[PDB]
Every structure is written in structure tokens, then in C-alpha cells.
């Protein structure tokens, strides 16, 4: 399995092209490597640091995660990995579930313009995954540390397969030949900033847009919740609380968050 090299993210470019003036991005760093962009930001938080609008990107990550929960093994520059701090305390606590939803929407937005022709099943899997042709293209990890939330984005641009990562998919696989990570990071952050603003405003557009690109709605899934608990039903729609309206044989189950696995 040969593989290596790849272009490096230019921090100086992303900085002066994304930080300050009008943008809601206060600060940006690129590191060669870390365990979890989320964990580190979660830590600046706990150290006193205002991480509102602070962006942190890793070239490589041993195990994407943080406060609670481990991770897995990946490969260097095979993907875009970044975290952003978001002040959430001014928004109704019942609405925080939408953040991870917005983030996944923002990723898909950043990427779609790259594909010449829409592939098979490619959209959003409630509540944390961006899929393309039924593979995991991107993962979204939302974590809370009042008055903050950290949004982690792991996006498979190059590849870095295939055990984490057990059925994911990289842009290359969707026929994008020479994806520029910098251009992508820049768009993704622009999409993110926008979606966040919407979320803060309780824009109804945010939910319609989500439902519009939802692969989960209309189909039949298994929702893996904490432990060996699993629910199988048909997703009808989501509520204003970013929760899944799940139709289990005629009876509705409203699961807040958790893993899903499209069956139908």
C-alpha cells in the first residue's frame, strides 16, 4: 500500500485570507499533528482561552476526539482536519443539537461544487456524517464545554483508508482529481461561518436546507444509541431541536443524537 507526499496547508494564506476584518474568524493555527483538534480547543477553553471563532487545523491526527471517547489511526495529509470554537451560551440550550447538523451541511456545501456530476446517494446522515455514494466522506464531532461548543471536522479528501474509516470515502473516489486543501479549507470555513450565523438566528432556512440534503429522511435506518441499544425505523423528519423523528412501526421515537446505519 504505497502512499505519501501531498501538498501542505498554508497557514499564512489561510490566515490573512480568513482572519479578522469582517470575518467571524478571530484566529487560526495549523499544526503538523495532534491527537484531537477538539481536545486541544476543549483545553484552551479550560485554560481560560476564549475560543469563540478560533480555528485549529491538524495535518495529521492520531485519534480524532477529545473529552471522553478515544479515536482511531489515520494517515498524514490524506484529509482535512480542523476544529472551531463557538460561543453557544447566548443560544437556547435546546437548540444546540443543530450545530453539528449545520457543520455537516457546511462540509457538503464546501465539497459539492467540486464534483462534475452528482453521484449516487450523497448528502447528510443524521446527525454527524456527510456521505457520498453511501460512504463516509466526512465526520462531524460536536462537543460541549460551556459556554462553548467545539466542532471537529474530519474530511477525507485524499483517502487514508480503510479502517476507521471502515467504509468512508475520499473526494478522489468521487472523481475529483487534484483537490486543493487550501481552497477547500477556505470554503468550508466560509460555509461554516454562515451556517453558524443562521443557527444563532434560528433561521428556518437552516432546517430546510438540511432536510433538502438529508439522506436519512424518507428512508429506513438503524439508530445505534449508547450501549447495545439499537432502534430500527423510518425517518420522517427532524424537529426544531435537531432531533430525529423516527417512525418505528407506527409508533414515533424521538432520538436526540446517536449513530445511524441506512438499511433501505
Author numbering: 3 to 266
From the reporting publication:
Acetyl Coenzyme A Carboxylase (ACC), an important enzyme that catalyzes the first reaction of fatty acid biosynthesis, is biotinylated by biotin acetyl-CoA carboxylase ligase (BirA). The Mtb-BirA molecule is composed of two domains; N-terminal domain 1 comprises of 7 β-strands (β1: 29–32, β2: 55–59, β3: 82–88, β4: 124–126, β5: 131–133, β6: 137–147 and β7: 150–158) and 6 α-helices (α1: 13–20, α2: 39–48, α3: 95–114, α4: 173–176, α5: 183–203, α6: 206–215), while C-terminal domain 2 is a SH3 domain with 5 strands forming an antiparallel β-sheet (β8: 220–227, β9: 231–240, β10: 246–250, β11: 253–257 and β12: 261–264). The two domains are linked together with loop L10 (216–219) that connects helix α6 of domain 1 and β8 strand of domain 2. All the apo BirA crystal structures have revealed the presence of disordered flexible loops, which undergo a conformational transition upon biotin and biotinyl-5′-AMP binding.
Structures of dehydrated (dhMtb-BirA) and hydrated (hMtb-BirA) Mtb-BirA, were determined at 2.69 Å and 2.8 Å, respectively, using crystals grown under similar conditions. The transfer of Mtb-BirA crystals to paraffin and paratone-N oil (cryoprotectants) and subsequent flash freezing resulted in the dehydration of the crystals and significantly reduced their solvent content. The asymmetric unit of dehydrated crystal form containing two molecules is more compact and densely packed with a low solvent content of 28% compared to the hydrated crystal forms. Additionally, the most interesting feature is the appearance of two missing loop regions L4 and L8 and 5 N-terminal residues in subunit A of the dhMtb-BirA. The electron density for loop L8 leaves little doubt as to the position of the atoms and though electron density for loop L4 is not complete, apex of this loop constituting residues R69 and H70 has a well-defined density. The two subunits of dhMtb-BirA have structural differences in their loops and defy the expected two fold symmetry resulting in an asymmetric dimer where, subunit A can be considered a representation of the active ligand bound conformation of BirA and subunit B is more an icon of apo BirA with disordered loops. The ordered loops L4 and L8 in the structure of dehydrated apo BirA form an open, large and spacious biotin-binding pocket. The overall changes in the subunit A of dhMtb-BirA structure appear to mimic those that arise during substrate binding and corroborate well with the established relationship between hydration, mobility and enzyme action.
